[PDB]
Design a protein around this ligand. Structure first.
Ligand SMILES: *[C@@H]1O[C@H](CO)[C@@H](O[C@@H]2O[C@H](CO)[C@@H](O)[C@H](O)[C@H]2NC(C)=O)[C@H](O)[C@H]1NC(C)=O
Ligand SMILES: *[C@@H]1O[C@H](CO)[C@@H](O[C@@H]2O[C@H](CO)[C@@H](O)[C@H](O)[C@H]2NC(C)=O)[C@H](O)[C@H]1NC(C)=O
Ligand SMILES: *[C@@H]1O[C@H](CO)[C@@H](O)[C@H](O)[C@H]1NC(C)=O
Ligand SMILES: *[C@@H]1O[C@H](CO)[C@@H](O)[C@H](O)[C@H]1NC(C)=O
Lengths: 49, 198, 49, 49, 33, 50
């Protein structure tokens, strides 16, 4: 969609393969606050939005 | 029975209480044995006495006790069919279903919304014989829930089958600081509302 | 394979229990709190159960 | 998509003849009331509805 | 979208089905603060 | 000085905290000493080749 009509995903009680998803996209910029991408790739979460 | 939406306005004739877009419906069903969560687009049918017609006062849900709540079998689409008699269910995002046990206890139901969706709390989960509400459902509703409407239930009780029905109360949640008291078994039986008095 | 605590009670171990990550000592106790919530914390949000 | 689209103005016109113009802004993480007009992206640049 | 089942084949609604009443009908106040 | 050939479109994969393949298998910047990252372009008419 466009930016004002964004699609929201919420993940609970599941396992992810971030790398299979990370390798499908080509990153250009990131800016985290309170976490890092590596910590997102190596951690366990109550939820992911 | 509830009707939670984001945009509200008048019907065609002019009576208030129409939802124009994806609307959340929390309809208990199965003679109090099932909860329906529907997130659908709601369409006033043009038939007589229905929300689209000129001769429309109010809509309501119901069920025929001797055919729906009969001993032989419990119909699980009674109130939902009575609802569909008034509205068309189009573009339904999801339809959930939650089982309910039959009893005459005093329960609590709460509902909130945040970034992660719509959250449903009930005392029936976790503390059935107490009064603490535990989360049991989360709904992928991410639009605002600006408005809600209590849907009038009406048991089709005939003169021989007429029965009394309990009233319920709806208390708004506020952004307040409390102080809680957890028992040894983890349940809360005592609190303090820090803004009430000195 | 290291997935049970039956015969390692009393020793300092690390844990990853449904995603909660830490280290500590496990001792068989009487059940307190709510069993449904799966964790018992304290007033400072430290896992003690 | 066909193109990239975004909302450049969202406002309420009040007064006797709708002669005053106040902006309607979003909160963090929320949708704009103006998304319902062209929810799949605007067709032309300058689409004053 | 998901399927909601078969539509309703009833042409007319049940006509106020315990007729509308917003008046001294409902003042059975049993306060529960 | 650590230097190498690197494309500009990939320079977010060498930021502190990145999660891709560069920091895992190619080069992770150390922060024990005062350090600095630089991404530059060499003009083609000098002695450096491609
Ligand atoms: C996580 O993702 C990687 C990349 O998709 C998976 O590795 C591949 O899995 C497929 C399975 O059909 C193999 O054909 C490939 O040879 C694997 N290698 C790569 C790098 O493509 C991996 O299986 C996934 N892991 C899990 C368990 O989800
Ligand atoms: C009672 O209501 C439920 C939910 O509206 C209907 O169940 C769905 O029916 C459609 C059409 O058959 C199916 O595609 C769905 O898979 C069903 N499941 C749900 C829960 O969405 C059910 O058919 C209705 N039953 C009666 C008596 O009409
Ligand atoms: C919501 O409903 C209104 C009126 O029914 C309609 O004009 C509007 O386009 C709808 N929003 C959508 C389809 O996103
Ligand atoms: C919604 O329902 C209509 C039928 O009323 C259908 O034409 C359309 O494809 C459906 N999808 C959406 C989200 O518009």
């Amino acid at each position: 969609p466009q930016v004002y009509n964004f699609n929201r995903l919420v993940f609970t009680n599941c396992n992810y393969n971030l790398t299979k998803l990370l390798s499908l996209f080509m990153v250009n910029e990131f800016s985290c606050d309170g976490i890092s991408p590596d910590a997102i790739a190596r951690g366990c979460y109550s939820s992911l939005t | 029975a509830f009707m939670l939406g984001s945009s509200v306005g008048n019907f065609s004739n002019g009576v208030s209480g129409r939802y124009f877009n994806h609307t959340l419906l929390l309809l208990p069903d199965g003679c109090g044995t099932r909860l329906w969560a529907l997130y659908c687009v709601i369409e006033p049918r043009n038939g007589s006495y229905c929300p689209g017609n000129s001769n429309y006062n109010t809509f309501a849900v119901f069920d025929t006790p001797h055919t729906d709540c009969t001993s032989a079998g419990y119909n699980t689409n009674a109130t939902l069919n009575s609802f569909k008699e008034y509205f068309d269910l189009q573009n339904c995002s999801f339809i959930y279903s939650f089982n309910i046990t039959e009893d005459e206890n005093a329960e609590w139901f709460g509902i909130t919304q945040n970034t992660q969706g719509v959250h449903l709390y009930s005392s029936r989960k976790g503390d059935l014989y107490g009064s603490n509400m535990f989360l049991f459902a989360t709904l992928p509703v991410y639009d605002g829930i600006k408005y809600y409407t209590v849907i009038p239930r009406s048991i089709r009780s005939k003169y021989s089958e007429r029965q009394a029905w309990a009233a319920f109360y709806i208390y708004s949640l506020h952004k307040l600081t409390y102080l809680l008291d957890f028992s040894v078994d983890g349940y809360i039986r005592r609190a303090v509302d820090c803004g009430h008095d000195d | 394979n290291s997935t049970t605590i039956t015969d390692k009670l009393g020793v300092c171990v690390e844990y990853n229990l449904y995603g909660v990550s830490g280290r500590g000592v496990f001792i068989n106790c009487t059940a307190v709190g709510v069993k449904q919530q799966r964790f018992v914390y304290d007033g400072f949000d430290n896992l003690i159960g | 998509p066909s193109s990239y689209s975004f909302i450049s103005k969202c406002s309420r016109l009040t007064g006797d003849n709708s002669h005053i113009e106040t902006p309607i802004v979003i909160n963090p993480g929320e949708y704009s009331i103006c998304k319902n007009f062209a929810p799949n992206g605007f067709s032309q640049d300058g689409d004053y509805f | 979208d998901v399927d909601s089942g078969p539509p309703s084949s009833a042409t007319s609604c049940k006509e106020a089905d315990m007729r509308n009443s917003s008046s001294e009908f409902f003042n059975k106040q049993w306060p529960m603060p | 000085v650590d230097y190498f050939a690197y494309p500009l479109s990939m320079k977010s994969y060498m930021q502190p905290g990145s999660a891709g393949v560069i920091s895992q298998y190619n080069y992770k910047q150390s922060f024990a000493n005062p350090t600095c990252r630089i991404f530059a372009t060499a003009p083609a008419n000098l002695t450096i080749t491609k």
